[PDB]
Amino acid sequence: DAIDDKTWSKLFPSIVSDPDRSSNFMIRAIYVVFSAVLRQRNILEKEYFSKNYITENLSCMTLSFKNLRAHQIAQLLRAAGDATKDGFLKEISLVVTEHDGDVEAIEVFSMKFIYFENGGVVARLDPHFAELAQLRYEGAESVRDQMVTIVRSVQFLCTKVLEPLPAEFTANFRLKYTNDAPSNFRIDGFDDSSTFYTLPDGIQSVTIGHLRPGHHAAHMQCWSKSM
């Protein structure tokens, strides 16, 4: 149960069965997908991104570590992804509002997490929970297919579905800790808050995709008003 792809090993672990590489895959996944969202949505210019290949078939723009600001965003995503190892991350979301500091967004790209006990069969315990709990781990090749699906869906959604973002907007990363997460444990780059994000009552919701490695599960959603 391993992926024998040259293009895949450049960005992702070839094995995702065991707990560690599963969480590692989640980290790399968060990086790739949110980089794709950032570029495809034109929140950041192409200069911040360097082009990479997940597959010989598809290419995306991944945040460049050389560029300082992009490195900052990348280390932010790295911290959030690293949280999945401890299992203290419930959700990470790219939130777009008109004014800086708003709790009501005009656009949201959310990624919701689920952690499995033991060998990675039983889910630990929200509306997103049940669906992912139903899933089984079907091998690394299937996980590759899921990643491919997510990225393609992201690019297609941003370019051929969504309307362009408004002239001025505030984007930022907001997350939610699990119930298990200690009060002294804080994700680097993320100041604590008593506010997450809220949505309009008529906001449109579309599902981008999901990922089921060995011991973890993710669900990528997209809320938007531009849609």
Binding site: I43, A171, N172, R174, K176, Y177, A181, I187, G189
Partner: peptide
């Protein structure tokens, strides 16, 4: 219950 935030743009 508990949340975290970041600055971008």
């Amino acid at each position: 219950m508990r949340y975290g935030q970041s600055p971008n743009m």
